[PDB]
Amino acid sequence: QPLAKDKVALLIGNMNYREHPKLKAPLVDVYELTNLLRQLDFKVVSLLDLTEYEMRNAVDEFLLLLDKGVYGLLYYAGHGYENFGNSFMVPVDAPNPYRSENCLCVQNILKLMQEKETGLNVFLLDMCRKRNDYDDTIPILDALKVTANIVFGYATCQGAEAFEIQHSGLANGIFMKFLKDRLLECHLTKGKQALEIRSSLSEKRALTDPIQGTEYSAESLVRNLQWAKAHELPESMCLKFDCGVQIQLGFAAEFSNVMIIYTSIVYKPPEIIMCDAYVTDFPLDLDIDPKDANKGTPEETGSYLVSKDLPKHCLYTRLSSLQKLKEHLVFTVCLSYQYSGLEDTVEDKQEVNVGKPLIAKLDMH
Amino acid sequence: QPLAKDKVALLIGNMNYREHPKLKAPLVDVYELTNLLRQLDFKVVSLLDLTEYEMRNAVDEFLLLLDKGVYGLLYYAGHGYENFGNSFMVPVDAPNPYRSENCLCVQNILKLMQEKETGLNVFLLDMCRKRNDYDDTIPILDALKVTANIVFGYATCQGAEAFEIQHSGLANGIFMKFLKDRLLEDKGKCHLTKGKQALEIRSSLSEKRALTDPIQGTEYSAESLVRNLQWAKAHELPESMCLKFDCGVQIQLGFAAEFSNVMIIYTSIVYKPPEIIMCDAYVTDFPLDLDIDPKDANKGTPEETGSYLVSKDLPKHCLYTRLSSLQKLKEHLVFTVCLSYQYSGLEDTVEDKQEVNVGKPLIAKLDMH
Numbered sequence: 001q002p003l004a005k006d007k008v009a010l011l012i013g014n015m016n017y018r019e020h021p022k023l024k025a026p027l028v029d030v031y032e033l034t035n036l037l038r039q040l041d042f043k044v045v046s047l048l049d050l051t052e053y054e055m056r057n058a059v060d061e062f063l064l065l066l067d068k069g070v071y072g073l074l075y076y077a078g079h080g081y082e083n084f085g086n087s088f089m090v091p092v093d094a095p096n097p098y099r100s101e102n103c104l105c106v107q108n109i110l111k112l113m114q115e116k117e118t119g120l121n122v123f124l125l126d127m128c129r130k131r132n133d134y135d136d137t138i139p140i141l142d143a144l145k146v147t148a149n150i151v152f153g154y155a156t157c158q159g160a161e162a163f164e165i166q167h168s169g170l171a172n173g174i175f176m177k178f179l180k181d182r183l184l185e186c187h188l189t190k191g192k193q194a195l196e197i198r199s200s201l202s203e204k205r206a207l208t209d210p211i212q213g214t215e216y217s218a219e220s221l222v223r224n225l226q227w228a229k230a231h232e233l234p235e236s237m238c239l240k241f242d243c244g245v246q247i248q249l250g251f252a253a254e255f256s257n258v259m260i261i262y263t264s265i266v267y268k269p270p271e272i273i274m275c276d277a278y279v280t281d282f283p284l285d286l287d288i289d290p291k292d293a294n295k296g297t298p299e300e301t302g303s304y305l306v307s308k309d310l311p312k313h314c315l316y317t318r319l320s321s322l323q324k325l326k327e328h329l330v331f332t333v334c335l336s337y338q339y340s341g342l343e344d345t346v347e348d349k350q351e352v353n354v355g356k357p358l359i360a361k362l363d364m365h
Numbered sequence: 366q367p368l369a370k371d372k373v374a375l376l377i378g379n380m381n382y383r384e385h386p387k388l389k390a391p392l393v394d395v396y397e398l399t400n401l402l403r404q405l406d407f408k409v410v411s412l413l414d415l416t417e418y419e420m421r422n423a424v425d426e427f428l429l430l431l432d433k434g435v436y437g438l439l440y441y442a443g444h445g446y447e448n449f450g451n452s453f454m455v456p457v458d459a460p461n462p463y464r465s466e467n468c469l470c471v472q473n474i475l476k477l478m479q480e481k482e483t484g485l486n487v488f489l490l491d492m493c494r495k496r497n498d499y500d501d502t503i504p505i506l507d508a509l510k511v512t513a514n515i516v517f518g519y520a521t522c523q524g525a526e527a528f529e530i531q532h533s534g535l536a537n538g539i540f541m542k543f544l545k546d547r548l549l550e551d552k553g554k555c556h557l558t559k560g561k562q563a564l565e566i567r568s569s570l571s572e573k574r575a576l577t578d579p580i581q582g583t584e585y586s587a588e589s590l591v592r593n594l595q596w597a598k599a600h601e602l603p604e605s606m607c608l609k610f611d612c613g614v615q616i617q618l619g620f621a622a623e624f625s626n627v628m629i630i631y632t633s634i635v636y637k638p639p640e641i642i643m644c645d646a647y648v649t650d651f652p653l654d655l656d657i658d659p660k661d662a663n664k665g666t667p668e669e670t671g672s673y674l675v676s677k678d679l680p681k682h683c684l685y686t687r688l689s690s691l692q693k694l695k696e697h698l699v700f701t702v703c704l705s706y707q708y709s710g711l712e713d714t715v716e717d718k719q720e721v722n723v724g725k726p727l728i729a730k731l732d733m734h
């Protein structure tokens with residue numbers, strides 16, 4: 001029987017490039033792939049918009065989980081490049097033009113995966129190439145794609161336009177389709193595209209293979225808790241203001257580095273006729289435009305989470321970039337309230353601290 | 366809207382290697398893709414077990430159909446190999462070891478397709494590579510300079526065992542799945558198995574193209590005429606016939622096209638007069654061109670002949686004979702239908718025989734020898 005010792009996954013989606021065309025596609029594709037992998041018993045990390053430093057720390061810690069018998073999946077979506085056989089994943093902080101030292105190399109990660117003694121390695125790259133970056137003419141000089149169980153997947157589109165066109169739609173990502181078709185148990189648009197799948201398997205492996213489950217393992221507890229504690233969300237607060245008004249502050253995870261906050265009035269005393277609550281004062285590291293806070297749908301914040309997913313009728317705020325948090329997520333719930341019978345509006349302020357939510361816990365900036 | 370000026374396809378499936386491990390997979394995959402393409406309004410040729418001479422003629426004549434705006438699909442399944450940046454399709458007569466002179470080069474065919482003013486080229490290869498071909502040459506190339514309106518697809522498995530395993534099942538061809546998902550506008554099952562495997566799909570499209578795009582039936586009337594005629598001249602199947610034997614017994618003799626180079630023949634008694642108590646009929650005397658063992662003729666299912674066709678597809682209650690290799694027919698398909706009959710009241714089994722000529726069925730009508 002093929003068994004997994006563990007099932008671990010790291011998904012990266014880069015979009016918000018400083019010096020390169022911004023992408024949109026990754027967000028959806030990471031979310032849907034996360035959601036698939038959860039149902040296959042994977043512990044997933046899902047990170048949007050990483051710098052070089054962030055990507056390296058993330059990938060290394062993924063690689064540290066790949067012991068003997070582990071099933072490991074790595075996914076990247078975003079800009080990439082190719083030179084002399086060597087492919088590169090570009091972080092959001094990379095300058096223009098691309099230099100190798102600003103980028104993470106595919107083949108290095110692949111070589112590291114092949115040393116680890118895993119039961120299955122999966123490495124899936126969905127890359128936007130620059131228009132005129134075709135594959136180079138090369139000899140093959142070095143390989144490990146025999147000695148360990150590998151599925152390697154490499155999609156390309158030439159240019160951001162063709163990339164975004166082919167990725168348009170929900171539920172439709174190339175690798176999610178591949179996984180569903182090939183590893184359990186969207187029309188061809190204009191432009192230039194490529195897909196490469198390569199595999200070397202000594203025996204049939206599938207994502208659906210059972211974990212060798214444990215009753216009393218220290219290692220398995222370690223593994224579980226290392227991941228689970230990187231995914232602590234704040235408990236919902238019922239914030240009581242001095243006038244008697246109660247604002248519920250709720251929290252949702254969207255990615256390992258994205259939290260939705262949402263606000264609702266849950267008590268209005270008879271002495272108050274009208275009230276509004278809003279959030280402000282977020283840490284500058286997280287970099288929120290208040291134009292994208294306090295919105296009347298989660299959709300308006302840029303969330304994948306829709307109005308049917310979250311509690312309804314709130315104001316919604318998306319706090320992305322949690323990996324950049326230095327201290328605590330200190331922010332302010334404000335209350336505006338009008339007293340019953342008066343025109344007079346009062347303001348009040350309640351500072352909230354929620355600690356280090358999600359990957360912010362690691363404190364690795 | 367994109368239009369095709371025509372839809373033409375050539376499918377080759379090579380299995381019966383003389384000097385190389387035999388394959389089984391191609392039969393099914395060619396049949397099922399042929400069926401799909403038929404339903405999309407392609408004129409299809411489907412050929413099993415071609416020599417180099419046969420492959421070259423077929424491919425060349427396929428390339429002749431690729432006029433302006435035509436949609437052309439070439440599919441190959443069987444052995445391939447790689448050498449110094451080139452890739453090769455191996456014909457069934459290929460010497461061991463593989464030498465380029467004996468094989469058809471993928472890169473040639475790809476550039477021959479890209480030279481045409483077609484509206485869409487599709488070129489799909491689904492190959493076995495022998496393990497020995499992994500270790501002998503340093504790789505360079507396999508990608509290609511995929512340009513024009515082209516969809517290049519290229520799949521490999523290392524070794525016949527892994528190849529056959531990955532292809533086990535009906536309905537489960539990688540390229541059929543691909544075309545259905547990616548190239549039809551609409552206007553589990555293939556589990557990844559052991560071994561070393563590769564897939565490469567490349568597309569270049571100046572505008573959206575699909576296999577479902579309607580045929581523009583205007584312009585280029587003589588080219589259209591010739592395409593249609595040439596194809597249809599390669600697909601004349603003989604009509605079903607009733608042979609009346611002089612004793613009164615009626616043998617039905619039916620025909621089915623399995624590939625452009627494979628015909629099923631089937632026989633049944635459709636009338637026994639009351640004077641005959643028992644009878645049986647069989648076929649014999651096929652031309653030596655077609656090779657066929659008489660122990661593999663006269664079977665009680667089409668499954669027993671080696672066909673894709675199951676007992677659902679043809680008339681039940683017959684004997685079935687499969688004639689492959691029709692492209693090698695140098696003359697007419699002449700055979701004998703035999704009858705054995707016992708009269709009521711007699712111990713005597715009488716024999717009778719009738720000769721049949723059905724001409725040159727299917728691709729044999731091209732007369733290429």
Ligand SMILES: CC1(C)CN(C(=O)Nc2cnc(-n3nccn3)c(Cl)c2)c2cnc3cc(Cl)nn3c21
Nearest residue numbers: 008009010043045057058061062227230323364365
């Ligand atoms: C939870 C762990 C063990 C940790 N990890 C990370 O990605 N760590 C990470 C570390 N530092 C930064 N950083 N931010 C700022 C600067 N450095 C970042 Cl972004 C991430 C992954 C990654 N993949 C999987 C999979 C499974 Cl299971 N656990 N797991 C983990």
Ligand SMILES: CC1(C)CN(C(=O)Nc2cnc(-n3nccn3)c(Cl)c2)c2cnc3cc(Cl)nn3c21
Nearest residue numbers: 373374375408410422423426427595596599692733
């Ligand atoms: C019917 C035509 C026009 C012809 N053709 C062939 O394959 N010709 C062919 C010629 N010679 C041999 N041979 N046998 C013995 C020796 N030489 C063989 Cl096997 C085949 C194809 C091939 N593809 C498509 C597609 C559409 Cl439409 N027509 N079409 C045609």
Ligand SMILES: [Ca+2]
Nearest residue numbers: 082134135136
């Ligand atoms: Ca390049």
Ligand SMILES: [Ca+2]
Nearest residue numbers: 084085086142
């Ligand atoms: Ca290298």
Ligand SMILES: [Ca+2]
Nearest residue numbers: 052101102103
């Ligand atoms: Ca650096």
Ligand SMILES: [Ca+2]
Nearest residue numbers: 028167168169
């Ligand atoms: Ca998508």
Ligand SMILES: [Ca+2]
Nearest residue numbers: 325326327363
């Ligand atoms: Ca700190």
Ligand SMILES: [Ca+2]
Nearest residue numbers: 344345346347
């Ligand atoms: Ca006031």
Ligand SMILES: [Ca+2]
Nearest residue numbers: 429430431432
């Ligand atoms: Ca012509």
Ligand SMILES: [Ca+2]
Nearest residue numbers: 417466467468
């Ligand atoms: Ca020759």
Ligand SMILES: [Ca+2]
Nearest residue numbers: 447448498502
């Ligand atoms: Ca070779």
Ligand SMILES: [Ca+2]
Nearest residue numbers: 532534535537
């Ligand atoms: Ca099959």
Ligand SMILES: [Ca+2]
Nearest residue numbers: 713714715716
């Ligand atoms: Ca007698």
